[model samples]
Target: SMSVKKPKRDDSKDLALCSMILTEMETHEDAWPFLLPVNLKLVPGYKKVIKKPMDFSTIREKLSSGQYPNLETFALDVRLVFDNCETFNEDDSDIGRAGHNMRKYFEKKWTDTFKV
Candidate 1:
């Protein structure tokens, strides 16, 4: 009981975080909230914005106009995110797991919603 509940709670938290990252993806102008480590933040040239690894969301935006995100690009961009991380600790951090979870969600939704 407790074990099952814990996973759900953790997933819910991670779920929120990932969506937050892409909330402004449509405009491509919103800054992300990912904070730099205090140590890294002080570096004169340190930048919090990692370059975007893929172009997504145009197809996604048309969804609001009754169009849908491409199943193919979602899978591709998710991996683009997965492959871009370096210092991110996959098992031990929220963003890494959130990215992974969101990737899984994209892959699953793509499979579930479309067939051709």
Candidate 2:
């Protein structure tokens, strides 16, 4: 008897899509706060407030390094930046508003491309 093995999944397409989305998002005006990690020195107690800090730069590095196997994991890190922002900033504040807008922008871009 002979058995067949499925081919290994290729994430090249997913990586390309992730790169395109990230590039567009980086140019978004609301992306300013998320472009870099939180500055603990400038933002007192930031490290204590945010447990797992994520940023565009970090996500970019991960993507380029092939650390993310698929789009799902890539999306998770992108969303983490917004989620962390919400936890640290007030809803009525500028940074908080930027987080909301950036999340919305990313979601729309995601659905338009992937429809999921």
Candidate 3:
């Protein structure tokens, strides 16, 4: 019988890059809002709107657990954090601006690192 398809390829380099990007984002000045989950009590209706609540702490946990199979997968969660921020906050608001800044910073770093 034909051999079964090989399992996922080794992604050590992808994980390392993911870890590096996450560490940088965690250390960013505007990372406070994304460090942890948004308190539903503090922000009523948050759950109703943001179906997928993504945050840095959660991303870190996923990374530690090796839940990400590729760099794009990790990047998706990171982008989700910013996307949620933008969807929830107004562009003129402080949090909104911070999200813009963080997203800009992340995109720059991602391009710089991968150059793709």
Candidate 4:
């Protein structure tokens, strides 16, 4: 019999990185639709199509299957910043400056790579 192991949950760093990626995606005009806030209230005569709540398992499944929208773009954005994080010392004032520069770098890279 074959045994299957459950995937580990994302750590705080991963979640933080994911949130940063989502924020960057939201700023892109072309990626606006996916970032829009869900309107839970219903207008008169309108039916609310309640979708299933998102869970870590679902996220893992989607990620494994490569079904996530704009995943490649999101990954590239996050990687740029994460890579930059390792290149600078945490104690330097320039680290703060580097963070700003990193954001600019990510925006430019994302725009150039995705043509957005």
Sorting all predicted structures by lDDT, with the top scorer first, yields 3, 2, 4, 1
Q: Per-residue alpha-carbon lDDT of model 4 for 11-114, expressed as tens digits?
A: 43544455554455446543321232223363322123322222223333445565645445445534443343334335254544544555565567556544
Cα displacement (Å) at residue 22, model 1: 8.3
How much does candidate 4 score in TM-score? 0.27
Q: What is the C-alpha lDDT of each candidate?
A: 0.41, 0.90, 0.90, 0.43
Candidate 1: C-alpha RMSD to true structure equals: 14.5
Q: Give residue 85's lDDT in candidate 2 (0 to 100).
A: 92
lDDT (Cα) of model 4: 0.43
**Clashes per model (N, Cα, C within 3 A):** 1, 0, 0, 0
lDDT, candidate 2, 1-116, per-residue tens = 25777776565578788899999999997888988878888998899989999999999999999899789999999999999999999999999999999999999999897864
Instruction: TM-score each candidate.
Output: 0.38, 0.87, 0.87, 0.27
Where's the lowest-lDDT run of ten residues in candidate 2? 1-10
What lDDT does candidate 2 reach at residue 29? 79
